Amino acid sequence: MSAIERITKAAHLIDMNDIIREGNPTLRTVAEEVTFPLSDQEIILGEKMMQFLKHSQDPVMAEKMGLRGGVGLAAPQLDISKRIIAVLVPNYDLEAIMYNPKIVSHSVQDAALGEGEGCLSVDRNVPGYVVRHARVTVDYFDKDGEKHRIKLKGYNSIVVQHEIDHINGIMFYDRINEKDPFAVKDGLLIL
Ligand SMILES: [Fe+3]
């Protein structure tokens, strides 16, 4: 059966085995927008994704399930090519399951996490500053089809852009400067 059918079973607990890794084509394909109303499966998927982030952040649960801590997850990482992402940033400073998220405005200023970025789908390290917009205005729909328009900055902005990149088939290392990975370009804010 399809990944979505499998993952949305009531009994299913997403774990690292459901997360596809580099090389799997799905991570480089642009995800299909979801239509409204959402199917029960699409709603359940978003919930399963958020439960996974919560489990990955619980020391006891993370150890038992063999999970890597994460603050974001995109459906393509589960081999589901739908524009659905989940973000969970503990202070939670940000908690959202977003359907068809889209950046509708961004700052001229860029930003990058000082400590760089990792990815549950990447088993290895690619050091460097992952250059992103410092600030973004994001439109997304929640499970009931209601539209939300939020403004993000700092770490939250980074996390959300990172997940939106997945639904567009972009990986974090694609935004690190090949030549000099730690170059601090003009207008780049290091967090
Ligand atoms: Fe990722």
Side-chain angles (χ1 to χ4, degrees), residues 1-4 6-26:
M1 48 170 51
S2 67
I4 198 174
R6 182 184 87 249
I7 288 167
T8 61
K9 296 300 178 202
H12 194 89
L13 302 174
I14 294 179
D15 60 30
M16 305 299 331
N17 271 303
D18 291 309
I19 290 165
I20 61 176
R21 317 301 168 76
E22 304 187 66
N24 184 315
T26 297

mmCIF file of all heavy atoms in Angstrom, residues 1-26, unseen atoms left out:
data_model
loop_
_atom_site.group_PDB
_atom_site.id
_atom_site.type_symbol
_atom_site.label_atom_id
_atom_site.label_comp_id
_atom_site.label_asym_id
_atom_site.label_seq_id
_atom_site.Cartn_x
_atom_site.Cartn_y
_atom_site.Cartn_z
ATOM 1 N N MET A 1 0.835 -1.244 0.000
ATOM 2 C CA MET A 1 0.000 0.000 0.000
ATOM 3 C C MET A 1 0.849 1.265 0.000
ATOM 4 O O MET A 1 2.049 1.215 0.274
ATOM 5 C CB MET A 1 -0.907 0.024 1.225
ATOM 6 C CG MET A 1 -0.189 -0.282 2.518
ATOM 7 S SD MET A 1 -1.240 0.052 3.940
ATOM 8 C CE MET A 1 -2.764 -0.853 3.511
ATOM 9 N N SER A 2 0.209 2.392 -0.302
ATOM 10 C CA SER A 2 0.888 3.684 -0.338
ATOM 11 C C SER A 2 1.360 4.095 1.054
ATOM 12 O O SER A 2 0.823 3.638 2.058
ATOM 13 C CB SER A 2 -0.041 4.762 -0.901
ATOM 14 O OG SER A 2 -1.128 5.009 -0.024
ATOM 15 N N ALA A 3 2.375 4.956 1.102
ATOM 16 C CA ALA A 3 2.898 5.418 2.368
ATOM 17 C C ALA A 3 1.812 6.105 3.161
ATOM 18 O O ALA A 3 1.710 5.894 4.363
ATOM 19 C CB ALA A 3 4.056 6.393 2.146
ATOM 20 N N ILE A 4 1.005 6.942 2.503
ATOM 21 C CA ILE A 4 -0.027 7.656 3.269
ATOM 22 C C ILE A 4 -1.037 6.716 3.897
ATOM 23 O O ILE A 4 -1.446 6.898 5.033
ATOM 24 C CB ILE A 4 -0.763 8.760 2.432
ATOM 25 C CG1 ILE A 4 -1.472 9.710 3.407
ATOM 26 C CG2 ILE A 4 -1.785 8.158 1.441
ATOM 27 C CD1 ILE A 4 -2.124 10.938 2.750
ATOM 28 N N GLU A 5 -1.420 5.678 3.162
ATOM 29 C CA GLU A 5 -2.382 4.719 3.679
ATOM 30 C C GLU A 5 -1.763 4.004 4.868
ATOM 31 O O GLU A 5 -2.390 3.842 5.918
ATOM 32 C CB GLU A 5 -2.767 3.721 2.559
ATOM 33 N N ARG A 6 -0.499 3.624 4.725
ATOM 34 C CA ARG A 6 0.194 2.942 5.791
ATOM 35 C C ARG A 6 0.379 3.787 7.051
ATOM 36 O O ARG A 6 0.101 3.353 8.171
ATOM 37 C CB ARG A 6 1.565 2.486 5.285
ATOM 38 C CG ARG A 6 2.341 1.728 6.308
ATOM 39 C CD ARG A 6 3.719 1.381 5.792
ATOM 40 N NE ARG A 6 4.683 2.454 6.032
ATOM 41 C CZ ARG A 6 5.207 3.187 5.068
ATOM 42 N NH1 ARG A 6 4.851 2.964 3.814
ATOM 43 N NH2 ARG A 6 6.106 4.120 5.357
ATOM 44 N N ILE A 7 0.855 5.015 6.865
ATOM 45 C CA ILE A 7 1.132 5.887 7.993
ATOM 46 C C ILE A 7 -0.083 6.403 8.718
ATOM 47 O O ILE A 7 -0.012 6.708 9.900
ATOM 48 C CB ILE A 7 1.992 7.070 7.516
ATOM 49 C CG1 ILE A 7 3.399 6.573 7.231
ATOM 50 C CG2 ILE A 7 2.018 8.214 8.581
ATOM 51 C CD1 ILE A 7 4.208 7.588 6.463
ATOM 52 N N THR A 8 -1.220 6.502 8.037
ATOM 53 C CA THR A 8 -2.401 7.037 8.718
ATOM 54 C C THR A 8 -3.282 6.013 9.440
ATOM 55 O O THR A 8 -4.365 6.345 9.952
ATOM 56 C CB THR A 8 -3.227 7.894 7.760
ATOM 57 O OG1 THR A 8 -3.693 7.104 6.643
ATOM 58 C CG2 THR A 8 -2.355 9.031 7.274
ATOM 59 N N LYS A 9 -2.818 4.766 9.473
ATOM 60 C CA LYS A 9 -3.536 3.733 10.227
ATOM 61 C C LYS A 9 -3.495 4.213 11.670
ATOM 62 O O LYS A 9 -2.491 4.773 12.105
ATOM 63 C CB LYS A 9 -2.831 2.374 10.112
ATOM 64 C CG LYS A 9 -2.812 1.836 8.703
ATOM 65 C CD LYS A 9 -4.233 1.646 8.177
ATOM 66 C CE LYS A 9 -4.230 1.141 6.733
ATOM 67 N NZ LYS A 9 -5.523 1.429 6.023
ATOM 68 N N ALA A 10 -4.581 4.021 12.410
ATOM 69 C CA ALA A 10 -4.621 4.454 13.796
ATOM 70 C C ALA A 10 -3.429 3.973 14.626
ATOM 71 O O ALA A 10 -2.878 4.710 15.463
ATOM 72 C CB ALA A 10 -5.915 3.964 14.464
ATOM 73 N N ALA A 11 -3.048 2.734 14.390
ATOM 74 C CA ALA A 11 -1.980 2.122 15.178
ATOM 75 C C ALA A 11 -0.579 2.536 14.784
ATOM 76 O O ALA A 11 0.376 2.303 15.540
ATOM 77 C CB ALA A 11 -2.086 0.634 15.082
ATOM 78 N N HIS A 12 -0.425 3.152 13.620
ATOM 79 C CA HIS A 12 0.931 3.495 13.198
ATOM 80 C C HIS A 12 1.649 4.622 13.964
ATOM 81 O O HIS A 12 1.080 5.665 14.274
ATOM 82 C CB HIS A 12 0.960 3.840 11.719
ATOM 83 C CG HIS A 12 2.344 3.880 11.153
ATOM 84 N ND1 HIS A 12 2.960 2.765 10.625
ATOM 85 C CD2 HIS A 12 3.235 4.895 11.042
ATOM 86 C CE1 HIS A 12 4.173 3.093 10.210
ATOM 87 N NE2 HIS A 12 4.363 4.379 10.454
ATOM 88 N N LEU A 13 2.924 4.386 14.262
ATOM 89 C CA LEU A 13 3.752 5.381 14.943
ATOM 90 C C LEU A 13 4.886 5.668 13.971
ATOM 91 O O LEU A 13 5.641 4.779 13.603
ATOM 92 C CB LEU A 13 4.306 4.815 16.248
ATOM 93 C CG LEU A 13 3.254 4.340 17.245
ATOM 94 C CD1 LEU A 13 3.966 3.666 18.411
ATOM 95 C CD2 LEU A 13 2.395 5.492 17.734
ATOM 96 N N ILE A 14 4.983 6.902 13.498
ATOM 97 C CA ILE A 14 6.039 7.195 12.556
ATOM 98 C C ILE A 14 7.370 7.049 13.267
ATOM 99 O O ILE A 14 7.534 7.501 14.402
ATOM 100 C CB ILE A 14 5.954 8.611 12.059
ATOM 101 C CG1 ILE A 14 4.653 8.781 11.234
ATOM 102 C CG2 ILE A 14 7.205 8.930 11.210
ATOM 103 C CD1 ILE A 14 4.429 10.175 10.677
ATOM 104 N N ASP A 15 8.306 6.400 12.613
ATOM 105 C CA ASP A 15 9.620 6.313 13.234
ATOM 106 C C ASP A 15 10.620 6.522 12.124
ATOM 107 O O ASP A 15 10.237 6.750 10.957
ATOM 108 C CB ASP A 15 9.846 4.981 13.974
ATOM 109 C CG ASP A 15 9.736 3.768 13.082
ATOM 110 O OD1 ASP A 15 10.041 3.857 11.877
ATOM 111 O OD2 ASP A 15 9.353 2.687 13.613
ATOM 112 N N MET A 16 11.907 6.448 12.459
ATOM 113 C CA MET A 16 12.903 6.713 11.456
ATOM 114 C C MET A 16 12.774 5.849 10.217
ATOM 115 O O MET A 16 13.274 6.208 9.154
ATOM 116 C CB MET A 16 14.313 6.591 12.068
ATOM 117 C CG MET A 16 14.519 7.479 13.305
ATOM 118 S SD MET A 16 14.290 9.239 12.859
ATOM 119 C CE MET A 16 14.769 9.177 11.191
ATOM 120 N N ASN A 17 12.105 4.698 10.313
ATOM 121 C CA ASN A 17 12.024 3.861 9.107
ATOM 122 C C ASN A 17 11.074 4.400 8.087
ATOM 123 O O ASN A 17 11.110 3.992 6.929
ATOM 124 C CB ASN A 17 11.619 2.427 9.445
ATOM 125 C CG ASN A 17 12.813 1.563 9.747
ATOM 126 O OD1 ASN A 17 13.730 1.434 8.922
ATOM 127 N ND2 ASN A 17 12.825 0.976 10.930
ATOM 128 N N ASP A 18 10.195 5.303 8.512
ATOM 129 C CA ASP A 18 9.261 5.885 7.568
ATOM 130 C C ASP A 18 9.884 7.067 6.845
ATOM 131 O O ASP A 18 9.337 7.544 5.863
ATOM 132 C CB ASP A 18 8.024 6.384 8.305
ATOM 133 C CG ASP A 18 7.189 5.255 8.867
ATOM 134 O OD1 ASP A 18 6.876 4.330 8.097
ATOM 135 O OD2 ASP A 18 6.825 5.310 10.059
ATOM 136 N N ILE A 19 11.023 7.538 7.357
ATOM 137 C CA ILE A 19 11.687 8.707 6.788
ATOM 138 C C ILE A 19 12.648 8.315 5.696
ATOM 139 O O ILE A 19 13.602 7.559 5.948
ATOM 140 C CB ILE A 19 12.405 9.486 7.900
ATOM 141 C CG1 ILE A 19 11.337 10.135 8.806
ATOM 142 C CG2 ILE A 19 13.364 10.523 7.293
ATOM 143 C CD1 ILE A 19 11.845 10.626 10.141
ATOM 144 N N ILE A 20 12.391 8.780 4.478
ATOM 145 C CA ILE A 20 13.274 8.457 3.371
ATOM 146 C C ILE A 20 14.549 9.288 3.411
ATOM 147 O O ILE A 20 14.569 10.395 3.967
ATOM 148 C CB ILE A 20 12.590 8.615 2.027
ATOM 149 C CG1 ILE A 20 12.136 10.065 1.819
ATOM 150 C CG2 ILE A 20 11.412 7.645 1.944
ATOM 151 C CD1 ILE A 20 11.543 10.289 0.459
ATOM 152 N N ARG A 21 15.623 8.743 2.839
ATOM 153 C CA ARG A 21 16.923 9.419 2.869
ATOM 154 C C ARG A 21 17.420 9.926 1.519
ATOM 155 O O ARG A 21 16.855 9.626 0.471
ATOM 156 C CB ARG A 21 17.975 8.482 3.475
ATOM 157 C CG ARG A 21 17.495 7.719 4.706
ATOM 158 C CD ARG A 21 17.067 8.657 5.819
ATOM 159 N NE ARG A 21 16.350 7.922 6.850
ATOM 160 C CZ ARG A 21 16.935 7.145 7.748
ATOM 161 N NH1 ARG A 21 18.253 7.013 7.746
ATOM 162 N NH2 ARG A 21 16.204 6.488 8.638
ATOM 163 N N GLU A 22 18.486 10.717 1.555
ATOM 164 C CA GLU A 22 19.047 11.250 0.319
ATOM 165 C C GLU A 22 19.017 10.195 -0.771
ATOM 166 O O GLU A 22 19.064 8.992 -0.492
ATOM 167 C CB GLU A 22 20.503 11.664 0.504
ATOM 168 C CG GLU A 22 20.780 12.652 1.598
ATOM 169 C CD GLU A 22 22.228 13.098 1.569
ATOM 170 O OE1 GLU A 22 22.619 13.762 0.588
ATOM 171 O OE2 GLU A 22 22.977 12.769 2.518
ATOM 172 N N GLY A 23 18.952 10.645 -2.016
ATOM 173 C CA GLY A 23 18.957 9.707 -3.110
ATOM 174 C C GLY A 23 17.583 9.237 -3.461
ATOM 175 O O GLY A 23 17.338 8.857 -4.605
ATOM 176 N N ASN A 24 16.672 9.226 -2.492
ATOM 177 C CA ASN A 24 15.327 8.801 -2.832
ATOM 178 C C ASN A 24 14.780 9.981 -3.600
ATOM 179 O O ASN A 24 14.738 11.100 -3.089
ATOM 180 C CB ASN A 24 14.482 8.545 -1.601
ATOM 181 C CG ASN A 24 13.117 8.016 -1.966
ATOM 182 O OD1 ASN A 24 12.461 8.528 -2.881
ATOM 183 N ND2 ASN A 24 12.685 6.977 -1.273
ATOM 184 N N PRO A 25 14.347 9.755 -4.835
ATOM 185 C CA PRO A 25 13.802 10.780 -5.730
ATOM 186 C C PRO A 25 12.718 11.688 -5.181
ATOM 187 O O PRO A 25 12.601 12.848 -5.584
ATOM 188 C CB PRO A 25 13.253 9.964 -6.903
ATOM 189 C CG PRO A 25 14.021 8.695 -6.839
ATOM 190 C CD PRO A 25 14.069 8.418 -5.375
ATOM 191 N N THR A 26 11.894 11.142 -4.304
ATOM 192 C CA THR A 26 10.784 11.917 -3.776
ATOM 193 C C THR A 26 11.238 13.201 -3.117
ATOM 194 O O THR A 26 10.513 14.179 -3.122
ATOM 195 C CB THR A 26 9.954 11.072 -2.807
ATOM 196 O OG1 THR A 26 9.402 9.970 -3.529
ATOM 197 C CG2 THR A 26 8.789 11.876 -2.230
#
